[PDB]
Amino acid sequence: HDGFQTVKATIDWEHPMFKLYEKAKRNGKWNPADIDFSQDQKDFASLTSEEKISALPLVAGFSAFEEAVTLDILPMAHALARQGRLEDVLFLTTFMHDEAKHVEMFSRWQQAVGIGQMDLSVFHNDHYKRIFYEALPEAMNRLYADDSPEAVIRAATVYNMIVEGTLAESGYYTFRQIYKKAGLFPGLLQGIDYLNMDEGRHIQFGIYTIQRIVNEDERYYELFIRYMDELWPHVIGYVDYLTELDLLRHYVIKQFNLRKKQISRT
Amino acid sequence: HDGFQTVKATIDWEHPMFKLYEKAKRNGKWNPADIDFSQDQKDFASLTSEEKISALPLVAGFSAFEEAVTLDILPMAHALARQGRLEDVLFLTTFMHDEAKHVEMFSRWQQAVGIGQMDLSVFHNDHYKRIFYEALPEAMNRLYADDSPEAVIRAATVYNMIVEGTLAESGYYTFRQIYKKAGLFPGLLQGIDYLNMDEGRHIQFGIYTIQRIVNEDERYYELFIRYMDELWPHVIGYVDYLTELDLLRHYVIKQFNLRKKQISRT
Ligand SMILES: [Fe+2]
Ligand SMILES: [Fe+2]
Ligand SMILES: [Fe+2]
Ligand SMILES: [Fe+2]
Numbered sequence: 001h002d003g004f005q006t007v008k009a010t011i012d013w014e015h016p017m018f019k020l021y022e023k024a025k026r027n028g029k030w031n032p033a034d035i036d037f038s039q040d041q042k043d044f045a046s047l048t049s050e051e052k053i054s055a056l057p058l059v060a061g062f063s064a065f066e067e068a069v070t071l072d073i074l075p076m077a078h079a080l081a082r083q084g085r086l087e088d089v090l091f092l093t094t095f096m097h098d099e100a101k102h103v104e105m106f107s108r109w110q111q112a113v114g115i116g117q118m119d120l121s122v123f124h125n126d127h128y129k130r131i132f133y134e135a136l137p138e139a140m141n142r143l144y145a146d147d148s149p150e151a152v153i154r155a156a157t158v159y160n161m162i163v164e165g166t167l168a169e170s171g172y173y174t175f176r177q178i179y180k181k182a183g184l185f186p187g188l189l190q191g192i193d194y195l196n197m198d199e200g201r202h203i204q205f206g207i208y209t210i211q212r213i214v215n216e217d218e219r220y221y222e223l224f225i226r227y228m229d230e231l232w233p234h235v236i237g238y239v240d241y242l243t244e245l246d247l248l249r250h251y252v253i254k255q256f257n258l259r260k261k262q263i264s265r266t
Numbered sequence: 267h268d269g270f271q272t273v274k275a276t277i278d279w280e281h282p283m284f285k286l287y288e289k290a291k292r293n294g295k296w297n298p299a300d301i302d303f304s305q306d307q308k309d310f311a312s313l314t315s316e317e318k319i320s321a322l323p324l325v326a327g328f329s330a331f332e333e334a335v336t337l338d339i340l341p342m343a344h345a346l347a348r349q350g351r352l353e354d355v356l357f358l359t360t361f362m363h364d365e366a367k368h369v370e371m372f373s374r375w376q377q378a379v380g381i382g383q384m385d386l387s388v389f390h391n392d393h394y395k396r397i398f399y400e401a402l403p404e405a406m407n408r409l410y411a412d413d414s415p416e417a418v419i420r421a422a423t424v425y426n427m428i429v430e431g432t433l434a435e436s437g438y439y440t441f442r443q444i445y446k447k448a449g450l451f452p453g454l455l456q457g458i459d460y461l462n463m464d465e466g467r468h469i470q471f472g473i474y475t476i477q478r479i480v481n482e483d484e485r486y487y488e489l490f491i492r493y494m495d496e497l498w499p500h501v502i503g504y505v506d507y508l509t510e511l512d513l514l515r516h517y518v519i520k521q522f523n524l525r526k527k528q529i530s531r532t
């Protein structure tokens with residue numbers, strides 16, 4: 001440690017990520033342990049065997065979505081801390097704790113409805129593993145040895161713009177539509193609503209991070225777009241697998257294109 | 267990623283660190299942004315120039331205590347995550363966010379009373395830097411390449427048992443005594459009270475971590491005691507410097523001996 005910013009001076013109170021940190025504390029009070037899952041248990045028990053296995057593929061993708069991102073944000077926090085970006089780090093403590101609650105929430109639902117013992121790994125095909133078992137952890141872990149603008153942009157693209165901002169967002173939108181209409185799983189849907197509010201902040205961090213790097217050299221804009229496209233085939237290839245197993249497809253394309261539009265070449 | 271625990275099964279609901287994580291969410295709602303510092307500003311302004319410089323040495327040690335530990339817990343989170351200790355990681359998200367609030371709180375006080383511009387690095391002597399600029403970050407950063415029981419015990423000893431559990435605890439106890447008696451700085455003291463409640467949980471993580479490793483091989487008990495003693499000279503050497511510049515001394519010895527007693531050879 002060369003010194004400490006709050007000894008030499010203070011926090012930068014006007015920093016965008018300090019402002020996001022403040023919002024996260026105000027809006028991040030929900031506790032998954034407070035959700036009543038008593039009705040979700042009766043709902044799941046009421047389902048036919050065939051109706052049961054219809055919910056499980058998305059729920060397997062969910063618990064893994066959340067456990068992966070809980071573990072995989074730590075190298076980003078390390079890299080930004082090493083660059084002295086104290087406000088970013090403060091914000092990322094709320095990011096990481098949010099992901100812990102999301103892991104917790106889905107595991108509490110599984111336990112409540114009685115599928116905790118079932119191994120749901122069956123429902124991750126080849127493209128799902130390419131992203132969540134491979135390209136996500138490789139891009140994040142890179143940052144321990146290579147924190148170049150190229151490496152940070154790629155980490156933020158894979159994690160924030162694709163995993164959270166394209167795939168997970170579409171999955172939760174889809175799952176909510178379906179079961180809100182059925183009147184089923186009110187505990188889980190309240191959980192997803194809280195989760196979606198959290199993830200609004202997470203995507204803003206990804207946008208800020210990519211944009212501040214693009215703002216130094218528009219070459220990085222073309223890197224951003226290329227990594228986005230590089231990843232699309234596996235994004236859709238997981239959708240197809242679930243399908244083979246419609247609205248999920250349409251919303252995913254929309255979200256992917258929206259994320260590109262939130263980054264400006266200049 | 268080999269798999270995801272909450273896909274294959276669930277969280278271990280009975281794990282001690284899951285229970286500590288639950289407590290942290292219940293008891294970790296305070297927000298430093300809600301503290302009224304209006305009276306602290308008038309108090310500091312009322313002090314004579316000489317009374318002012320009496321508070322500053324401890325406050326410089328404080329803002330650095332907290333900024334160092336915010337950054338320096340990340341390698342422990344990485345190491346335990348790599349070992350698949352999901353419940354420990356969940357808990358450590360509350361640990362890291364608590365430290366962010368502690369950094370924030372002290373920086374908000376400095377800003378409110380009008381010392382934010384002053385560089386307080388003057389008040390870290392040689393032993394303070396040995397611990398906080400050197401031995402703390404080296405022991406934590408080691409865990410990126412060496413997560414052996416020896417390395418984890420040493421990290422937990424330096425960070426949790428010495429930095430937090432011996433020095434910071436004694437400093438806050440001392441500072442509170444003094445100013446509570448004077449009727450001064452009620453905002454700061456409310457901040458320290460909240461901070462002290464948080465740090466109760468942090469020390470329990472350190473104890474759990476050391477004890478679970480000692481429980482595999484009592485050789486590690488003698489390592490624990492030796493690292494504790496290795497560090498004492500610099501612990502007291504910072505006390506002496508502040509003194510030269512009494513109750514702080516007495517409480518520090520007590521806390522040091524208490525921390526050893528919380529680890530059992532068997
Ligand atoms: Fe997220
Ligand atoms: Fe395919
Ligand atoms: Fe702490
Ligand atoms: Fe000395």
Ligand SMILES: [Mn+2]
Nearest residue numbers: 066098099102
């Ligand atoms: Mn999430």
Ligand SMILES: [Mn+2]
Nearest residue numbers: 332364365368
């Ligand atoms: Mn602290």
